């Protein structure tokens, strides 16, 4: 149905020294398609999905230059932010950038964003209207004043409603085999006794795409808010995703409990109960 | 595609 393109950026000052670690990655949906790493050999934007390889030399030169440019902006940033927060040069610091766009099921523009962090707390973020800024603290208000006079939002809105959206469609059409696929979750349930009167039922969902899934437990047709362990959705490393959800059950009453799986690759929601 | 505008020093 609805899609997204997203670019992620990390610069770490390694200092008393300098020369920062820069890594950039691009995703379409839950699939990585490009990367840059300053540590890596090539100093180029590199393909990380089959469908991006068909792009020409113009694209790779254009992305390399634009990614190299992001990096050197962030290097000046690291110098500047030390000054704005009176931090010394002995310690390591981190900037982070995220931008991208969402589209709906018709592939029309839904929402854009451009956010920025320093030392893992929010610094400055573009508001949903794409014409104004939320600045977190007082140093970020100085950045907000710079960016207001420089028309950064105007430029960002042009990218986020045009170029982001128009390239997302192109990526979705060139790799429609990969990107417009939905791997349904493959589900099972295991049973483990912890004592002589209690037992753990663990409901599994394996090899699904996209990563968005909802696992819920129900005792006699009613949502189990209580004793529910529920892990972080983890990757398999082949492109697909895994997740479980577990509950503790007083023994011999295991058949009272139902596991409910909703994911968009499924024709109907799934109901596993143990047996 | 990456942004070729709108990316400015803080």
């Amino acid at each position: 149905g609805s899609h997204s393109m997203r670019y992620f950026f990390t610069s770490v000052s390694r200092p008393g020294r300098g020369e920062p670690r820069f890594i950039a990655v691009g995703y379409v949906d839950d699939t990585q398609f490009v990367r840059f790493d300053s540590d890596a050999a090539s100093q180029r934007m590199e393909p990380r999905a089959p469908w991006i390889e068909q792009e020409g030399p113009e694209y790779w030169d254009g992305e390399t230059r634009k990614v190299k440019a992001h990096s050197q902006t962030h290097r000046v940033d690291l110098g500047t932010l030390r000054g704005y927060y009176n931090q010394s040069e002995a310690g390591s610091h981190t900037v982070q950038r995220m931008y991208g766009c969402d589209v709906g099921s018709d592939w029309r523009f839904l929402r854009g964003y451009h956010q920025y962090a320093y030392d893992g707390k929010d610094y400055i973020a573009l508001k949903e209207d794409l014409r104004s800024w939320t600045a977190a603290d007082m140093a970020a208000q100085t950045t907000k004043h710079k960016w207001e006079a420089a028309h950064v939002a105007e430029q960002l809105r042009a990218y986020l409603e045009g170029t982001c959206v128009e390239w997302l469609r192109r990526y979705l059409e060139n790799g429609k085999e990969t990107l417009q696929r939905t791997d349904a979750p493959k589900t099972h349930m295991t049973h483990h006794a912890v004592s002589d009167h209690e037992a753990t039922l663990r409901c599994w969902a394996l090899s699904f795409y996209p990563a968005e899934i909802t696992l819920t437990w129900q005792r006699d047709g009613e949502d189990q808010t209580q004793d529910t362990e529920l892990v972080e959705t983890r990757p398999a490393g082949d492109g697909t995703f895994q997740k479980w959800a577990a509950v503790v059950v007083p023994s011999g009453q295991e058949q009272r409990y139902t596991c409910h799986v909703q994911h968009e690759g499924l024709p109907k929601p799934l109901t596993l109960r143990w047996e | 595609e990456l942004a070729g505008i709108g990316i400015l020093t803080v």
């Epitope: 254009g62 050197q72 902006t73 105007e154 | 070729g4």
Partner: T-cell receptor, first 113, second 102 residues
Framework: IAGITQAPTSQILAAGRRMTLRCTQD?????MYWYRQDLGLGLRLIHY???????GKGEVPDGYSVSRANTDDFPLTLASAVPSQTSVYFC???????????FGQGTRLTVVE | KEVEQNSGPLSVPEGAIASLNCTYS??????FFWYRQYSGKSPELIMF????GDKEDGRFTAQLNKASQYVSLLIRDSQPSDSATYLC???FGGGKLIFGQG
């Protein structure tokens, strides 16, 4: 009033000499550029620089050196003076990469043998 | 790479509409610029355009068609002071800001 100046405005070089064209900018701009303009084929990018400290190569960097020690200065220097480098030279700058460029005065340069 | 302009010299009489086009080779170019340059002078900016479609400034209309790789400048009502070589500038990367032939 913040601007961009080039120096000198005109120069006659002997063949095999060295010449540095200065270009400075008050406007706190990150990105700076060097161009050559010739009678048939328009402006032509020699070198660029996206931020202070960093540089880059354009369409025709051959014969041309460049340096970015500070935000303000972007001097173009020519190591060997070939007769092919007779042009009008334009320094420029923009607030960040991909934005509107503001040009210097220009420099008429003629290398004679 | 290539930025090709509408091949001059054009000759448009007074009070009329002059029209210059610009084509570029990079599908992913995101910023586009029109400069005016008098005889032995610096280029100075007429307009920038980022988004697809029409931009208005006085006697000047910018038009951008990114799918067609097309920028144009329509000069309405042209004065004798509009006589200059007109320059188109397309940005190809970070600092790869590349120009037409004029």
């Amino acid at each position: 009033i913040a601007g961009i100046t080039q120096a000198p405005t005109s120069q006659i070089l002997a063949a095999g000499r060295r010449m540095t064209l200065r270009c400075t900018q008050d406007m706190r701009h990150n990105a700076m550029y060097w161009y050559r303009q010739d009678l048939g084929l328009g402006l032509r990018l020699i070198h660029y620089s996206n931020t202070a400290g960093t540089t880059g190569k354009g369409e025709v960097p051959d014969g041309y050196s460049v340096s970015r020690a500070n935000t303000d200065d972007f001097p173009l220097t020519l190591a060997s003076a070939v007769p092919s480098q007779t042009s009008v030279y334009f320094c420029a700058s923009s607030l960040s990469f991909g934005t509107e460029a503001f040009f210097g005065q220009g420099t008429r340069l003629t290398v004679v043998e | 790479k290539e930025v090709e302009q509408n091949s001059g010299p054009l000759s448009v009489p007074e009070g009329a509409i002059a029209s210059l086009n610009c084509t570029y080779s990079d599908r992913g170019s995101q910023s586009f610029f029109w400069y005016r340059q008098y005889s032995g002078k610096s280029p100075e900016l007429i307009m920038f355009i980022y988004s697809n479609g029409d931009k208005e400034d006085g006697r000047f209309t910018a038009q951008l068609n990114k799918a067609s790789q097309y920028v144009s400048l329509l000069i309405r009502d042209s004065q004798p002071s509009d006589s200059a070589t007109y320059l188109c500038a397309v940005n190809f990367g970070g600092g790869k800001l590349i120009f037409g032939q004029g």
